Design a protein around this nucleic acid. Structure first.
Ligand SMILES: O=P(O)(O)O[C@H]1[C@H](OP(=O)(O)O)[C@H](OP(=O)(O)O)[C@H](OP(=O)(O)O)[C@@H](OP(=O)(O)O)[C@H]1OP(=O)(O)O
Lengths: 56, 157, 237, 161, 138, 35, 18, 176
RNA sequence: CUCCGAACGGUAAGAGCCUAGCAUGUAGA
């Protein structure tokens, strides 16, 4: 099935591989689970501008 | 909050108690998970008593909100006694509650067939909130010490 | 499982106030190092102190000769590791016990940066003494047992790193001092001066007198007095 | 007197948001007091009443609140109150064709405690049950058959207030 | 707001009609605030402070200024505009500016005494920025 | 009868101070003779 | 050496505050 | 990951911030492909791109209840708990109707009733149609105005519970 | 003619791998 080369483990499902990705020692070397939000305005402004630019 | 604290306090994330005081499993998983679940006659009895309580209290809540008038609180207390028989909190907990239920149904038979002796007595109607306070107040009154002691041993566990 | 009447407390843990106010609690908080129910009572050691409590239970502390909330000692004031491995303790101890233990620990809201309580922080507004030294790292169970102390080695090496004697008065005489030097060795020229209440002694090649320098650094206690000792000339000045 | 509402404003627990070392006590003493339920079903306002009020005894933990007023009505007062509701109820059925009852579930079975719209209530459909006592015969007691909790709390004409 | 009395003010509530509405709006705005910033209990001091301010305003309008009638003061006490035990506690000569009613009960403190809110500042210590934990201030 | 009443109360519930610091207190925190 | 006492409340607390 | 996305930012009205929907629906939405792709990584601009990618309105469908991508985006927004300015900008953006519907649902879920009315009053004028998924999984045609009127009415939608404060007359007598 | 029942006695037995909802609030320098 799924294969994790970082841990070299065989995952029998998709949730096991997605879990092995982050939420483990591999994430601990990748910065563990910490992720914040990006500002408030500028993220939604640039996101809406890039989305409207790519759309049309 | 109380019973949900007991439920999450037993390291069992499979069940989610309805805030209208039911209990339903989530994952359609039992057997092994059910074998640490299906227990505690005290928890089922206490959930039953609070279920009747919260049915009463929420009935008066929507009364004082939006459809209180005279139909709702009267008919709801009456069918709340008849549904203490038919809907909620049934005999699975303790033995004699069927006897108090049958006395409740008979009292409802008396009060209805006399109060509907005239043109009013026919369909669903007022059916004065008179036996419910009395009957089930005495039933919880007797159940006070017994459910207290058994739930106290349950809290000790 | 363990009730008592009064705590086996320190003299510094109680506080620098002759009247404090305790609050007994029958069967509280579950003793730190043996896991047994005991009788927790806290108090306020003084004004703007830490509201100190009781950790280590009555049998826990009574058995191992230690106080119920600091685990140092009722007799001396040293840790339980120094007072076991190591006498030397009497010159190593201190009187006037510093009340730098009974003070509030560091406000973590201030360490992060936003202590909202302003001047009203009932915690303490200093900087966190850097993590690196193992005196940032001691615990209770390793402290309470003799095994692995961060303090007790650092104070046990204070015990081996580091003549004008005076304070004679009417207790020290010449024959007592020369017989207390006679167990160290023989004299070359000794004298006793009484205008300053002092004594002068020498030795063949020091050495033996060297351990007298180990014996008399405000430490040689004979006739019930802390003697005064500073260095001689040894320079023909 | 609003301290109950504000302290109970902690339905959840941000593990320290009224939630640090209070969760233990909150899970504990609730099973001491189901009896609070036996007082709580007691003092419910009767049909002849509108809403009135009650005493309440709150622990500072706020995980329990028994209703302390052991309900204490009078003899012919409560008799004529519930019987007045009987006469007005029967003649109410005589009049309307009111094809209505309540819902089975009084609220929906996923909802919250609904603390808000009667946390500031300001809304009482208080046309409850009082048959209009005609001021020719009932004149000895027109101020009497209208008090839910003040019926016995009359403090006048010998009530031992 | 609901009155639940059906009395309709004998002398009229018009005099202190607007001040009571502003106090109720301030109390609702204080109760609608979240538990952010307060450690365990620092957010509950504002409701008690607003209740103490409303009780002091009712005491100054009823007893001190002597403008409103006694029937209006009784209607405000029965409605909820002021407290009954606080008006009796502030009427004593020993204290007229108490912080709250949680510092006067002798069974509230664990040491079996009074709190620091009802204490003289001239008899206390010089350096003390302490405030009442159950009332809010001193 | 008082001892039996206390024992029965304990079974039903189950089923100032002046101490002179005469141990080490001599000059540290001087003035503590009765505490 | 500890023992009980029956000491003046007011003067105890007064000397404490002082 | 699935526990909470904010360490200490804010709280919900009367429940947990991550528990606004039902626990059975949360457990069903905890195991999905798009839900795992969102829980692997989710930012504000990533949520905006995920809202602009999928245009559908619905809840769970079929006997094996699987969440909709709009419900997954709503769960990720409820977990992440963004600021009110980003929600107001998403509700005010008329370019993406699905992102506007997601912002309206987030404002009706975690916002106050006065702010919900002030955000739903421009929402009633949007006559643009939108794709909707039925309970059996079949596609249904609807409009944004009907969904806004259903969100401004009592909670009858699936996997949603958001009561109001009072009637329109009582709220007009209380304030503006 | 209108007296309505609930649970236990019931789902196996394990092998290697994978992921989670919680809980304590300390004396020390
Ligand atoms: O069908 P009946 O034998 O004539 O008795 C019925 C019946 O009571 P019972 O079945 O318990 O004897 C109804 O209760 P249900 O079981 O049908 O729910 C009850 O109505 P309530 O629920 O309000 O008590 C009322 O019937 P009705 O709806 O007309 O009031 C009553 O007697 P009657 O039919 O003679 O009135």
């Amino acid at each position: 099935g799924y294969y994790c080369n970082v841990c070299d483990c065989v995952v029998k499902d998709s949730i096991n591989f997605l879990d092995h990705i982050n939420g483990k020692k591999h994430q601990r070397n990748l910065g563990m689970s910490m992720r914040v939000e990006r500002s408030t305005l500028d993220q939604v402004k640039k996101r809406f501008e890039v989305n409207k630019k790519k759309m049309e | 909050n109380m019973l949900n604290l007991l439920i999450h306090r037993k390291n069992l994330n499979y069940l989610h108690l309805d805030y209208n005081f039911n209990l339903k499993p989530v994952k359609t998983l039992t057997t092994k998970e059910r074998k640490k679940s299906r227990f505690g006659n005290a928890f089922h009895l206490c959930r039953e008593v609070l279920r009747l309580t919260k049915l009463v209290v929420d009935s008066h809540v929507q009364y004082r909100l939006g459809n209180v008038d005279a139909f709702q609180l009267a008919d709801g207390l009456q069918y709340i006694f008849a549904h203490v028989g038919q809907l909620t909190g049934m005999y699975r907990y303790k033995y004699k509650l069927m006897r108090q239920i049958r006395m409740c149904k008979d009292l409802k038979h008396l009060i209805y067939y006399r109060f509907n002796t005239g043109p009013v007595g026919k369909g669903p109607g007022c059916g004065f909130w008179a036996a419910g306070w009395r009957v089930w107040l005495f039933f919880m009154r007797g159940i006070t010490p017994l459910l207290e002691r058994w739930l106290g041993n349950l809290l000790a566990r | 499982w363990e009730d008592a009447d009064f705590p086996i407390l320190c003299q510094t843990c109680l506080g620098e106030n002759p009247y404090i106010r305790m609050t007994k609690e029958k069967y509280g908080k579950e003793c730190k190092i043996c896991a047994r129910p005991f009788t927790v009572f806290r108090w306020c050691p003084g004004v703007r102190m830490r509201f100190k409590k009781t950790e280590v239970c009555q049998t826990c502390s009574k058995l191992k000769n230690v106080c119920q909330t600091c685990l140092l000692d009722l007799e001396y004031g040293l840790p339980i590791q120094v007072r076991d491995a190591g006498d030397m303790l009497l010159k190593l101890a201190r009187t006037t016990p510093y009340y730098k233990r009974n003070r509030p620990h560091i406000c973590s809201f201030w360490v992060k940066g936003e202590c909202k309580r302003g001047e009203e922080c009932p915690y303490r507004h200093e900087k966190p003494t850097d993590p690196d030294d193992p005196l940032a790292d001691q615990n209770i169970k390793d402290r309470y047992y003799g095994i692995n102390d961060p303090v007790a080695d650092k104070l046990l090496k204070r015990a081996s790193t580091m003549l004008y004697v005076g304070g004679l008065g009417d207790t020290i005489t010449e024959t007592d001092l020369r017989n207390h030097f006679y167990q160290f060795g023989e004299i070359r020229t000794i004298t006793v001066v009484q205008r300053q209440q002092c004594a002068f002694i020498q030795f063949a090649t020091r050495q033996a007198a060297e351990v007298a320098a180990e014996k008399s650094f405000n430490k040689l206690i004979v006739n019930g007095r802390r003697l005064n000792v500073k260095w001689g000339r040894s320079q023909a000045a | 007197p609003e301290h109950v509402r504000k302290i109970i404003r902690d339905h959840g627990d941000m593990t320290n948001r009224k939630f640090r070392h209070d969760k233990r006590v909150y899970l504990g003493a609730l099973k001491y007091m189901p009896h609070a339920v036996l007082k709580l079903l007691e003092n419910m306002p009767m049909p002849w009443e509108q809403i009135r009020d009650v005493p309440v005894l709150y622990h500072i933990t706020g995980a329990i609140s028994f209703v302390n007023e052991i309900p204490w009505v009078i003899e012919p007062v409560y008799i004529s109150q519930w019987g007045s509701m009987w006469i007005m109820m029967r003649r109410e059925k005589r009049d309307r064709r009111h094809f209505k009852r309540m819902r089975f579930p009084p609220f929906d079975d996923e909802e919250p405690p609904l603390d808000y719209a009667d946390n500031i209530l300001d809304v009482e459909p208080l046309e409850a049950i009082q048959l209009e006592l005609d001021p020719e015969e009932d004149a000895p007691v027109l101020d009497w058959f209208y008090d839910h909790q003040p019926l016995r709390d009359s403090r006048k004409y010998v009530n031992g207030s | 707001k609901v009155k639940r009395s059906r009395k309709a003010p004998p002398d009229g509530w018009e005099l202190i009609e607007p001040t009571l509405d502003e106090l109720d709006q301030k109390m609702r705005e204080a109760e609608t605030e979240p538990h952010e910033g307060k450690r365990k209990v620092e957010s509950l001091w504002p409701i008690f402070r607003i209740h103490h301010q409303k009780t002091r305003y009712i005491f100054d309008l009823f007893y001190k200024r002597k403008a409103i009638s006694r029937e209006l003061y009784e209607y405000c006490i029965k409605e909820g505009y002021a407290d009954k035990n606080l008006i009796a506690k502030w009427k004593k000569q020993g204290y007229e500016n108490l912080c709250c009613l949680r510092c006067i009960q002798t069974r509230d403190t664990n040491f079996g005494t009074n709190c620091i809110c009802r204490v003289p500042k001239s008899k206390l210590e010089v350096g003390r920025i302490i405030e009442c934990t159950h009332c809010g201030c001193r | 009868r008082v001892a039996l009443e206390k024992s029965v109360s304990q079974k039903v519930a189950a089923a100032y101070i002046r101490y002179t610091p005469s141990q080490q207190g001599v000059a540290f925190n001087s003035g503590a003779k009765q505490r | 050496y500890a023992e009980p006492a029956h000491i003046n409340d007011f003067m105890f607390e007064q000397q404490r505050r002082t | 990951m699935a526990n909470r996305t904010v360490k200490d930012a804010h709280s919900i009205h009367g429940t947990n911030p991550q528990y606004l929907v039902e626990k059975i629906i949360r457990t069903r939405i905890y195991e999905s492909k798009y839900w795992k792709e969102e829980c692997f990584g989710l930012t504000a601009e990533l949520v905006v791109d995920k809202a602009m990618e999928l245009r559908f309105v619905g809840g769970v469908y079929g006997g094996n209840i699987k969440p909709t991508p709009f419900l997954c985006l709503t769960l990720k927004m409820l977990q992440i708990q963004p600021e009110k300015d980003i929600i107001v900008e998403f509700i005010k953006n008329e370019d993406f109707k699905y992102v506007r519907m997601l912002g309206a649902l987030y404002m009706r879920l975690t916002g106050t009733a006065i702010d919900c009315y002030k955000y739903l009053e421009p929402l009633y004028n949007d006559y643009r149609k939108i794709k909707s998924q039925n309970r059996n999984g079949e596609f249904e045609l609807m409009h944004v105005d009907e969904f806004i009127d259903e969100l401004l009415h009592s909670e009858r939608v699936c996997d949603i519970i958001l009561p109001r404060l009072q009637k329109r007359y009582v709220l007009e007598e209380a304030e503006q």
